[PDB]
Structure 1
């Protein structure tokens, strides 16, 4: 009809501008200049950050207990991973009954997807690679949430693997993006038909799963059952493209990094760079969830926020290809 221009304008939110919401005392994290697309903070205040996403790659570490925490690059060791193609994207952590910390990392060596499993060796500041996971039901993985050392839910932001086909898929509005449950002897699709499923996380009691649908501007809440299956419970809508979801383990609150305007993030223009926006969502099961814009700007400081998490009154914000911001709430 040429109501395809209309679908494009709403999916990519092409008219949105950003009302500023300032915080006291924000500082750029020195040494992060090429992306910090996803990050996860352990209960002890150690923060993992994936960087150098292309569409060289590193996992960074900050100790948020420090007054002015510096970043260091974690050393990856092992012979089961080829670091020369390491291209990390979403991450997740899992802490076993023995306090072993596992880090799961979405990796895009070339056009493909894998999920890399590491064991974090705290004293050594290093990651011991353990396993490379790949599967037909993980064609185009964006993020995962770990529920065991090699067990996770994964979003696929596209159905296709080939970037040319992905591009058609996205622009055609097929909405074939889907979510997969992966475990050693049980891999299945758990929800499907998304327009660019992206962020994913879980409530601290393991009973609910949250899935960001980037181009629909939605967060889906699902009940998670004892048999690992998901059923739809509710859908929240926003005026922003929602990217990664972090969950505060104390409250269960969601902290979501967002892209107010889709044009600016998908078609990068240094003269009109993407801005940043962080939402907090409280009481997500109640009749009126409380949604607060905690931080928002047009990118004169931080461009393309994807993720945000809090730790003891500090907010750490990452981006797809730019810097990271550390703020007092």
Structure 2
């Protein structure tokens, strides 16, 4: 009976959101089947993954494929366009994109890394962004025993990244049990061409992951524990615990403002509404800002929140020059003035 009290805190079973309004929010035209992750380059180009199919999660078009979208946030009325995937090393028909990350090389080549779930497996797909042609050149499919159930990655090189696994098991049945039981066996993996190893473990659904603009610190979101973990990142790529922030919302993906180092976090206020869909009780949205995360008292602000009648199931938010872009597991996306 301790397993029913725990399941109910973990999943925030009776929480309701306190709305926090922003002026001039607009749904992004063309985004109606998810925008689980996104990343804004310094130049204001934004990549969005959409169409995620996740075992046991709502989907309005179970049979249409995922895609990567592009938005130019320097435009005042930004429109989304579908990036074309070129290459013969990847089967696009099964494409099911999840978390993403980018890395800009010394030569200014932009690499896009994309978590992909063809079937119940996980890969990380490496693309080279071709800006002029609005297209993604496929370079490499990455798979490993230590990338069983990848949720997000943060790129530290063109085929180098830290990855969260949100489950230990691959079989959808077992990981459903693993989640309900609260085993907390999910873990974080460092991947490079030369070395692949676990760098942190024992997580209740590890989810978002990102890095400070100076590379010194790594941030890991633990969804069902409502925690964000901070780590010291050494030059040999090991991680050592430093802090743990707690929240009373389910934290999903982390974005990092390059100018300040602030974390911007997409959150699920109520775990039941996001995990067990019900078109009559849709899940809401919530966006946190965390400032001076190393200080003794970090500043945590709710910047946007709503019960779901506009935007359902916020997973990610990032800011660009006064605007805020918010994405969701399977619903729409919102572009707001701050």
Runs of 4+ in 1 over 6 A off after TM superposition: none
Task: String of CA shifts for 1:25-81, please: whole Å, max 9, x gaps.
Answer: 000000000000000000000000000000111000000000110000000000000
Task: String of CA shifts for 1:238-292, please: whole Å, max 9, x gaps.
Answer: 0100000000000000000000000000000111100000000000000000000
Q: CA deviation at 1:3?
A: 1.9
**TM-score, scaled to structure 2:** 0.97
Q: Structure 1 unaligned runs (5+)? A: none
Contact 2:3–2:181 at 8 Å: present in 1 too? Answer: no
CA distance in 2, matches of 1:82, 1:76: 10
**Partner of 1:308 in structure 2?**
317
**Secondary structure at the residue paired with 2:273?**
helix
Task: String of CA shifts for 1:267-326, please: whole Å, max 9, x gaps.
Answer: 001111000000000000000000000000000000000000000000000000000000
CA distance in 1, matches of 2:22, 2:248: 21
CA distance in 2, matches of 1:21, 1:172: 34
**TM-score, scaled to structure 1:** 0.99
Aligned residues: 328
Say whether 1:188 aligns with 2:197.
Answer: yes
CA distance in 2, matches of 1:309, 1:103: 17
CA distance in 2, matches of 1:16, 1:221: 26
CA distance in 1, matches of 2:13, 2:182: 16
CA distance in 1, matches of 2:18, 2:194: 48
**Partner of 1:209 in structure 2?**
218
CA distance in 1, matches of 2:123, 2:168: 15
Q: Structure 2 unaligned runs (5+)? A: 55-64
Task: String of CA shifts for 1:186-220, please: whole Å, max 9, x gaps.
Answer: 00000000000000000000000000000000000
Q: CA deviation at 1:130?
A: 0.2
Task: String of CA shifts for 1:83-130, please: whole Å, max 9, x gaps.
Answer: 010000000000000000000000000000000000000000000000
CA distance in 1, matches of 2:146, 2:163: 9
Root mean square deviation, CA, Å: 0.4
CA distance in 1, matches of 2:315, 2:207: 10
